[PDB]
Amino acid sequence: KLADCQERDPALSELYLVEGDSAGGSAKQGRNRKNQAILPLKGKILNVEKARFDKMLSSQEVATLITA
DNA sequence: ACTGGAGAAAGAAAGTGAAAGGAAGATAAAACGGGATTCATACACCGTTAAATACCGGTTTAAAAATCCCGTGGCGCGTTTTAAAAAATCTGTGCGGGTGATTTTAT
Protein backbone atom coordinates (compact mmCIF):
# COMPACT_ATOMS: atom_id res chain seq x y z
CA LYS A 1 0.00 0.00 0.00
CA LEU A 2 3.00 2.33 0.27
CA ALA A 3 3.51 4.93 -2.48
CA ASP A 4 7.17 5.90 -2.16
CA CYS A 5 9.11 8.91 -3.41
CA GLN A 6 12.26 9.13 -5.55
CA GLU A 7 14.68 11.02 -3.28
CA ARG A 8 17.33 8.85 -1.61
CA ASP A 9 18.28 11.39 1.09
CA PRO A 10 16.17 10.94 4.26
CA ALA A 11 16.76 14.57 5.29
CA LEU A 12 14.82 15.77 2.21
CA SER A 13 11.86 13.37 2.36
CA GLU A 14 8.42 13.46 3.96
CA LEU A 15 5.78 10.89 4.89
CA TYR A 16 2.02 11.43 5.14
CA LEU A 17 -0.41 9.29 7.16
CA VAL A 18 -4.08 9.17 6.13
CA GLU A 19 -7.16 7.39 7.43
CA GLY A 20 -8.04 5.12 4.51
CA ASP A 21 -8.11 4.37 0.81
CA SER A 22 -10.65 7.08 -0.04
CA ALA A 23 -8.37 9.78 1.36
CA GLY A 24 -5.24 8.08 0.04
CA GLY A 25 -6.48 8.11 -3.54
CA SER A 26 -7.09 11.86 -3.37
CA ALA A 27 -3.75 12.47 -1.66
CA LYS A 28 -1.72 10.49 -4.21
CA GLN A 29 -3.05 12.50 -7.16
CA GLY A 30 -2.07 15.90 -5.75
CA ARG A 31 1.31 15.15 -4.20
CA ASN A 32 4.78 15.95 -5.49
CA ARG A 33 6.09 12.49 -6.36
CA LYS A 34 9.75 13.53 -6.16
CA ASN A 35 10.06 13.82 -2.36
CA GLN A 36 6.67 12.89 -0.89
CA ALA A 37 5.24 9.52 0.17
CA ILE A 38 1.75 8.39 1.20
CA LEU A 39 0.81 5.52 3.53
CA PRO A 40 -2.88 4.76 4.17
CA LEU A 41 -4.18 3.35 7.44
CA LYS A 42 -7.41 1.44 8.13
CA GLY A 43 -9.91 2.86 10.62
CA LYS A 44 -9.15 3.48 14.27
CA ILE A 45 -5.85 2.09 15.52
CA LEU A 46 -5.17 -0.07 18.56
CA ASN A 47 -4.79 1.68 21.92
CA VAL A 48 -1.36 0.56 23.15
CA GLU A 49 -1.88 1.98 26.64
CA LYS A 50 -4.59 -0.56 27.51
CA ALA A 51 -3.11 -3.48 25.53
CA ARG A 52 -0.27 -5.93 26.09
CA PHE A 53 3.02 -6.30 24.24
CA ASP A 54 2.07 -9.57 22.52
CA LYS A 55 -1.30 -8.09 21.53
CA MET A 56 0.53 -5.11 20.03
CA LEU A 57 2.89 -7.40 18.12
CA SER A 58 0.02 -9.50 16.74
CA SER A 59 -1.55 -6.41 15.14
CA GLN A 60 -1.29 -5.76 11.40
CA GLU A 61 -1.50 -1.97 11.05
CA VAL A 62 1.21 -1.52 13.70
CA ALA A 63 3.42 -4.02 11.86
CA THR A 64 2.90 -2.18 8.56
CA LEU A 65 3.74 1.16 10.19
CA ILE A 66 6.88 -0.27 11.80
CA THR A 67 7.99 -1.78 8.48
CA ALA A 68 7.42 1.55 6.72
C1' DA B 1 49.37 7.99 -16.62
C1' DC B 2 46.48 8.70 -13.37
C1' DT B 3 41.77 9.45 -11.05
C1' DG B 4 37.23 8.58 -9.77
C1' DG B 5 32.65 7.27 -11.17
C1' DA B 6 29.81 3.40 -12.95
C1' DG B 7 28.44 -0.82 -14.65
C1' DA B 8 29.06 -5.84 -14.69
C1' DA B 9 30.90 -10.55 -12.35
C1' DA B 10 31.47 -13.27 -8.82
C1' DG B 11 30.90 -14.98 -4.36
C1' DA B 12 28.52 -15.87 0.27
C1' DA B 13 24.46 -15.51 3.49
C1' DA B 14 19.45 -15.67 4.17
C1' DG B 15 14.55 -17.04 2.82
C1' DT B 16 12.07 -20.78 0.58
C1' DG B 17 8.98 -24.94 -0.90
C1' DA B 18 8.88 -29.61 -0.09
C1' DA B 19 9.88 -33.55 3.40
C1' DA B 20 9.05 -38.82 6.74
C1' DG B 21 7.27 -39.32 10.72
C1' DG B 22 5.30 -39.46 14.96
C1' DA B 23 2.76 -38.34 18.78
C1' DA B 24 -2.03 -36.73 18.90
C1' DG B 25 -5.69 -36.59 17.97
C1' DA B 26 -10.07 -38.09 15.63
C1' DT B 27 -14.02 -41.65 14.15
C1' DA B 28 -16.87 -46.96 13.68
C1' DA B 29 -17.41 -51.97 14.86
C1' DA B 30 -17.82 -54.87 18.78
C1' DA B 31 -18.38 -56.68 23.09
C1' DC B 32 -20.59 -55.55 27.31
C1' DG B 33 -24.41 -54.93 30.75
C1' DG B 34 -28.99 -53.60 32.33
C1' DG B 35 -34.18 -53.78 32.03
C1' DA B 36 -39.58 -56.17 30.29
C1' DT B 37 -42.19 -61.20 29.84
C1' DT B 38 -43.09 -66.50 30.88
C1' DC B 39 -43.98 -69.67 33.00
C1' DA B 40 -42.79 -74.72 35.34
C1' DT B 41 -40.80 -75.89 39.06
C1' DA B 42 -38.77 -75.85 43.44
C1' DC B 43 -39.63 -73.42 47.80
C1' DA B 44 -42.48 -71.65 52.02
C1' DC B 45 -45.98 -72.93 55.68
C1' DC B 46 -48.76 -76.36 58.41
C1' DG B 47 -49.76 -81.13 61.69
C1' DT B 48 -46.85 -85.84 63.87
C1' DT B 49 -43.42 -88.26 66.17
C1' DA B 50 -38.37 -90.80 67.58
C1' DA B 51 -34.52 -89.23 68.93
C1' DA B 52 -30.81 -86.34 70.12
C1' DT B 53 -29.36 -83.08 73.36
C1' DA B 54 -29.38 -79.90 77.50
C1' DC B 55 -29.11 -80.02 82.47
C1' DC B 56 -28.08 -81.21 87.61
C1' DG B 57 -24.61 -83.22 91.70
C1' DG B 58 -19.98 -84.10 93.00
C1' DT B 59 -14.54 -84.98 91.81
C1' DT B 60 -10.08 -83.56 89.81
C1' DT B 61 -6.35 -82.25 87.58
C1' DA B 62 -3.76 -80.55 84.50
C1' DA B 63 -3.42 -76.35 82.51
C1' DA B 64 -3.70 -71.39 82.64
C1' DA B 65 -3.63 -67.31 85.59
C1' DA B 66 -0.99 -64.45 88.91
C1' DT B 67 3.55 -62.40 90.69
C1' DC B 68 8.60 -60.54 90.62
C1' DC B 69 13.14 -58.89 88.13
C1' DC B 70 15.04 -56.69 84.39
C1' DG B 71 16.47 -54.85 79.84
C1' DT B 72 15.58 -53.03 76.12
C1' DG B 73 13.40 -51.02 71.54
C1' DG B 74 8.93 -48.36 70.60
C1' DC B 75 6.54 -44.13 71.44
C1' DG B 76 7.19 -38.94 72.67
C1' DC B 77 9.24 -33.95 71.85
C1' DG B 78 11.26 -30.46 69.29
C1' DT B 79 12.35 -28.74 64.72
C1' DT B 80 12.33 -29.13 59.51
C1' DT B 81 10.42 -30.14 54.64
C1' DT B 82 6.64 -30.54 51.39
C1' DA B 83 2.57 -31.02 48.97
C1' DA B 84 -2.46 -29.18 49.22
C1' DA B 85 -5.96 -26.11 49.69
C1' DA B 86 -7.47 -21.22 49.75
C1' DA B 87 -7.41 -16.39 48.78
C1' DA B 88 -5.90 -12.91 45.42
C1' DT B 89 -5.13 -11.31 40.89
C1' DC B 90 -5.55 -11.23 35.77
C1' DT B 91 -8.21 -12.34 30.87
C1' DG B 92 -12.05 -12.60 27.74
C1' DT B 93 -16.66 -11.07 26.03
C1' DG B 94 -20.93 -8.99 24.67
C1' DC B 95 -24.26 -5.19 24.65
C1' DG B 96 -25.01 -0.30 20.66
C1' DG B 97 -23.60 3.74 17.91
C1' DG B 98 -19.22 5.24 15.26
C1' DT B 99 -14.23 4.85 11.80
C1' DG B 100 -12.39 2.27 7.86
C1' DA B 101 -11.93 -1.90 4.68
C1' DT B 102 -12.51 -7.40 1.70
C1' DT B 103 -14.40 -11.98 -2.08
C1' DT B 104 -16.86 -15.42 -5.96
C1' DT B 105 -19.87 -16.41 -10.22
C1' DA B 106 -22.45 -15.48 -15.91
C1' DT B 107 -22.42 -13.52 -20.53
Swiss-Prot record:
Disulfide pattern: none
Transmembrane stretches, start-end: none
UniProt-annotated binding residues for Mg(2+) 1: E19
Record site: Interaction with DNA: K44, N47
Subcellular location: Cytoplasm
Mutagenesis or variant effect for K42E: In nal-31, nal-109, nal-115 and nal-120 mutants; resistant to nalidixic acid
Subunit structure: Heterotetramer, composed of two GyrA and two GyrB chains. In the heterotetramer, GyrA contains the active site tyrosine that forms a transient covalent intermediate with the DNA, while GyrB binds cofactors and catalyzes ATP hydrolysis.
Domain free text: Consists of 3 domains; the ATPase domain (residues 1-220), the transducer domain (221-392) and the toprim domain (393-804). ATP-binding is cooperative, and both subunits must be wild-type at residue 103 for supercoiling to occur. Non-hydrolyzable ATP analogs (and ATP-binding) induce dimerization and enhance ATPase activity. ATP hydrolysis induces domain shifts that are probably part of the mechanism of DNA cleavage and rejoining.
UniProt family annotation: Belongs to the type II topoisomerase family.
The protein's role, per its UniProt record: DNA gyrase negatively supercoils closed circular double-stranded DNA in an ATP-dependent manner to maintain chromosomes in an underwound state. This makes better substrates for topoisomerase 4 (ParC and ParE) which is the main enzyme that unlinks newly replicated chromosomes in E.coli. Gyrase catalyzes the interconversion of other topological isomers of double-stranded DNA rings, including catenanes. Relaxes negatively supercoiled DNA in an ATP-independent manner.
Miscellaneous field: When the enzyme transiently cleaves DNA a phosphotyrosine bond is formed between GyrA and DNA in an ATP-independent manner. In the presence of quinolones this intermediate can be trapped and is used as an indicator of drug toxicity.
The protein's name in its UniProt record: DNA gyrase subunit B
Shown chain mapped onto the complete sequence: 406 to 473 of 804
